[PDB]
Amino acid sequence: DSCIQFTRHASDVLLNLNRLRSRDILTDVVIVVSREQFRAHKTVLMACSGLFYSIFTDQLKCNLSVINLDPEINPEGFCILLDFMYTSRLNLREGNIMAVMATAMYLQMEHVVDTCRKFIKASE
Amino acid sequence: DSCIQFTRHASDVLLNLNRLRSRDILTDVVIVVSREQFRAHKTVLMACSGLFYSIFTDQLKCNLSVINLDPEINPEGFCILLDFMYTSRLNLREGNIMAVMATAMYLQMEHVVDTCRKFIKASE
């Protein structure tokens, strides 16, 4: 086509989706990770995670308002990944890298899994 | 903070939101523009438009499944702007620029209004 493109548009959209999440606006699901609860937008979770994409395209699970993750999932690792989904920024630290990588593998977030593998390999 | 950032994350999220729109997955509103109907995600519309942001933060309008736009709004101009919201690409042409600019002013999409003004000024 002969379209023009606004370079900052995708980043501006994601910033506004994170503002809606922070104010709990039009969030339609709560993700339960052991004792912890995280409110989010189903569409953003699907857009970021192969696991959520599979869950919310399922004809019965698409209608659930609560999703319980596997008990082995660490709430902090989930929180870090949820923040990444809505911002593009990953808070990866020596103290959380193992939990973040395991959560990213479970959530099927291949680019996160890739950077965790590389950061671990460099420390070996 | 000490975060790392994935450069293509925002663009990848927007691409997946457009894929969900094309397959009509988790769309929660229909925008009526005279005889034409457009299905979309309320969160994406709010993230792109000052008008939709105001509409869907309203305590009664947030729950509507159908929104009717002003009869002066051109369906093609709306279609072009909806495509822009989900892709960052604007199909701006001599034959549609006036309808696109008027629709962008109504929808409160200031960056689109700005490029339309500049493209019109250059042709004068």
Binding site: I4, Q5, F6, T7 | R89, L90, H111, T115
Partner: peptide
């Protein structure tokens, strides 16, 4: 704005 750019030519993509």
């Amino acid at each position: 704005w750019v030519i993509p």
